[PDB]
From a paper:
A prominent member of these so-called Knallgas bacteria is Cupriavidus necator H16 (formerly Ralstonia eutropha H16), which employs four different O2-tolerant [NiFe]-hydrogenases for generating cellular energy from the controlled oxidation of H2 in the presence of O2.5 Among them, only the tripartite membrane-bound [NiFe]-hydrogenase (MBH) is directly linked to the respiratory chain. The MBH large subunit contains the catalytic center composed of a nickel and an iron ion, which are coordinated to the protein by four Cys-derived thiolates. The most distal cluster relative to the active site is a [4Fe–4S] cluster coordinated by three cysteines and a histidine, while the medial cluster is a [3Fe–4S] species with three cysteines as protein anchors. However, in the proximal position, instead of a standard Cys4[4Fe–4S] cluster, the O2-tolerant MBHs possess a [4Fe–3S] cluster coordinated by six cysteine residues.13–16 The unique architecture of the [4Fe–3S] cluster is associated with a redox-dependent structural flexibility that allows two redox-transitions within a physiological potential region, i.e., the cofactor can assume a super-oxidized, an oxidized, and a reduced state. In order to obtain insight into the individual role of the supernumerary cysteines in the coordination and function of the [4Fe–3S] cluster, we purified C. necator MBH derivatives carrying exchanges of cysteine for glycine at the positions 19 and/or 120 in the small subunit HoxK, which are hereafter referred to as MBHC19G, MBHC120G and MBHC19G/C120G.
Even in the MBHC19G/C120G protein, which contains a four Cys-coordinated [4Fe–4S] species, oxidation resulted in cluster flexibility, indicating that the binding pocket is optimized for an Fe–S cluster of larger dimensions, i.e., the Cys6[4Fe–3S] cluster. The function of the Cys19-derived thiolate bridging Fe1 and Fe4 in the native [4Fe–3S] cluster, was taken over by the additional sulfide S4, which also formed a covalent bond to Fe3. The corresponding crystal structure also showed a “cubane-like” [4Fe–4S] cluster with some structural flexibility of the Fe3, S1 and S3 positions compared to the reduced MBHC19G/C120G. Interestingly, the mFo-DFc electron density maps of both oxidized and reduced MBHC19G/C120G uncovered a positive density at the former position of Cys120, which is most likely a water molecule based on SAD data. Thus, the Cys4[4Fe–4S] cluster in MBHC19G/C120G is similar but not identical to the classical Cys4[4Fe–4S] cluster of O2-sensitive [NiFe]-hydrogenases.
Residue numbers in the entry:
A (entry chain L): 3 to 244, 247 to 603
B (entry chain S): 5 to 273
Write the structure that this text describes.
Amino acid sequence: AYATQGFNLDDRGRRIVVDPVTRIEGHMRCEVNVDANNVIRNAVSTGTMWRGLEVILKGRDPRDAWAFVERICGVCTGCHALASVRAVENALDIRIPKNAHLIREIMAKTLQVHDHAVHFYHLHALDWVDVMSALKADPKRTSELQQLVSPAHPLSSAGYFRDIQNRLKRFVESGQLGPFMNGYWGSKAYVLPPEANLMAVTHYLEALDLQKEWVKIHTIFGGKNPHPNYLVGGVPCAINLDGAASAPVNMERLSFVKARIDEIIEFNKNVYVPDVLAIGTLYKQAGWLYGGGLAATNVLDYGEYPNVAYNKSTDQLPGGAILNGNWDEVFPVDPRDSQQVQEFVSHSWYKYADESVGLHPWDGVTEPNYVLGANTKGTRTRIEQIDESAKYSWIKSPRWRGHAMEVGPLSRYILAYAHARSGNKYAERPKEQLEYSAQMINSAIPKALGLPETQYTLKQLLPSTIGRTLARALESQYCGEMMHSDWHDLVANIRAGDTATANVDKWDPATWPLQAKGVGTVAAPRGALGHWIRIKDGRIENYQCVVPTTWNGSPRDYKGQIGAFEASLMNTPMVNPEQPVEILRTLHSFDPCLACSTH
Amino acid sequence: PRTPVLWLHGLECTGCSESFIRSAHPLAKDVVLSMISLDYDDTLMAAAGHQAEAILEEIMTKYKGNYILAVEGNPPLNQDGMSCIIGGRPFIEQLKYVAKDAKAIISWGSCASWGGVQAAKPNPTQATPVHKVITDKPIIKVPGCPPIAEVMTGVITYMLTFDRIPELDRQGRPKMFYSQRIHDKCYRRPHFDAGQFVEEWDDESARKGFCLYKMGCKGPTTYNACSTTRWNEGTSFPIQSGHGCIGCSEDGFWDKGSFYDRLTGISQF
Ligand code: SF4
Ligand code: SF4
Ligand code: F3S
Ligand SMILES: [Cl-]
Ligand SMILES: [Cl-]
Ligand SMILES: [Cl-]
Ligand SMILES: [Mg+2]
């Protein structure tokens, strides 16, 4: 047992293993210890995959890198491509044209929406929603619930909910439950009434059908989804508004994109945000405010979405770092500073010359070292209980000035809130969303459902699994709104006569400096993403990625400090220690992408 | 009534799973609820840990030699196989265990089919395609990074309707989807035939939709349905949106030189 970051870690209790962790991207193992009352008193995050993209990139052409690193992940598809082209452009002093900037922003915001909405419904919702309970719901009461939760959503009649309920029923009555087989249905950890469950399941089905439409924006600009194409110096989708049909982008293609954006805005406003507000309210009323972890103290994002390109002071999700829960002081974060972002491997399956220090990613090293500690139960190829006192993950341990940080939509919303309080006007919309959301959760939704009003502040409500889930939904809404404005600006710029989509001045490596280094950052769906590159004689000398889930899923560092996943699980009661309902609910609130975390 | 699919994930990016759920005809929703029984799939399944693992035994017993094994990604042979760990054991052990009683095996995507990005030089994990590990079962390769959504569901639909694997080419790919090179029906072909090429990004030729051969387009050597079926319900494909094909359905495309290096012997095509 030891204490770190205010958490009292104790591994003397009953050990519980969750392997595989499902409804995530990629491969994770989680172990916890619980005390005599089933409260988690230790948590262990193990990334269970590695591919070695950083090693594979050595010696290749920087112009090709984006395509390799894009394949780090098909869920956050394109965010790595964006970081890569930014990193190469930074290294080579390349400024992309305005239309390329706007198209990339629209693609990024499209990914945010798609990734957030699919995550919540198809990966997260079954931690909050009991599908078998939905079978017992009254269709009439479900219709009435729907009208209170989201008055503007047109799909609200009793017959519509009866139809969905019956298909679900027939499916279950078949005896082949598919994705619902061996679920934790009926657990007391589930608190929603049947009507709320049926509403949510119905939206799970609606979103599965709709998500395929949103990504057609990627298809227009990048050819395909998953894995749309990017380009060092701009975008490949050349513009000819007028032989119009022969160019990748003409007015009709832009109108198509706008139609998809308008649909996105509708879905976020009428389905996604209201569902999360309603589910959050009900779990809040049940007292389930666990899972805050490091969000209560330390949060980080690089900052993103400048309304003036290459001017970070105009970031619409302004970033930086908060420490010790002091929301009155946002420290600037510089990805170029060797003393800020650093990665440790003390408890990771890698080796450094000296593992008592952290390496900034321009000096990063990726040499595998799969070895298990002396207190392991089982063998090298058959682990029963992992030894977290030694090396226990394929995930490296990123820290900021040595501090363990949480990253993600929640981090960005806390930072935006802090920025807005300090007088930053670019953060006014997220501040508004948060204040609106607090009032809905505390007062409006309780009043409408006949529940008592509460008086939680944002500082109390946000650092929690509920809060983490809420911030994701709000971010989706904000990204939809922002890309709606980006579309107008793109169309306006083209109509003014600027059709440029690529700067090719430094496309040929004969124009390059013989060595260079660059960094590209992105506010990826799961948090702060960076790619750091060194170029030598036209080739990649080093390429290091530090990815959002690398931060959140980090194992312990040299100092034994715990990362976001491990901290978030601490001090959480489990209804039944052999059913990981609460572990899954909190882990999933981070939207873990394990392929990302390890690359 | 509904054929079980056990969908396993090795070393992968999850792009093949994502592509699958973009299918419009049929809807993935209808595939899951009405066509297959998707009984194991890490991305979507309610059960985790011991409860998830327990499903594999149950389905394999009850539906012995009558389930489809679908594989996204691949097994690593380095690090004693523990660069991909499932249930504290190497992924290759799960793959071999589930494969032995499968009616048919689908290798989804370039990773499962050929090695994928992780198998590109120097292949630190010795990632190995499914057919080099499972040598005694019928395997259909559905390559692409990822494959087109409707190609993935088209394979499932054929297999469910006929209870047969569709006719395959020498490389194990379905002829109904992989018989044509991209270049055969690519709408920019008349430009290629007229020697009309893009030479620099966003030049006048690019704005007129000229052929992308000189920008590295690998369409002339790449077999897929992209130029006809196209992507995301026929919305576009790489070439229509202005980037050359990078050859993503072809074996070892990652190590066939820069994506922007043109093919040589233009007379060939
Ligand atoms: S083929 Fe491509 S898209 Fe599919 S699971 Fe491999 S890297 Fe990802
Ligand atoms: S080289 Fe590429 S762009 Fe040109 S016609 Fe062939 S497939 Fe189309
Ligand atoms: S890159 Fe791949 S998606 Fe089709 S156009 Fe070429 S085979
Ligand atoms: Cl950019
Ligand atoms: Cl390959
Ligand atoms: Cl070749
Ligand atoms: Mg890294």
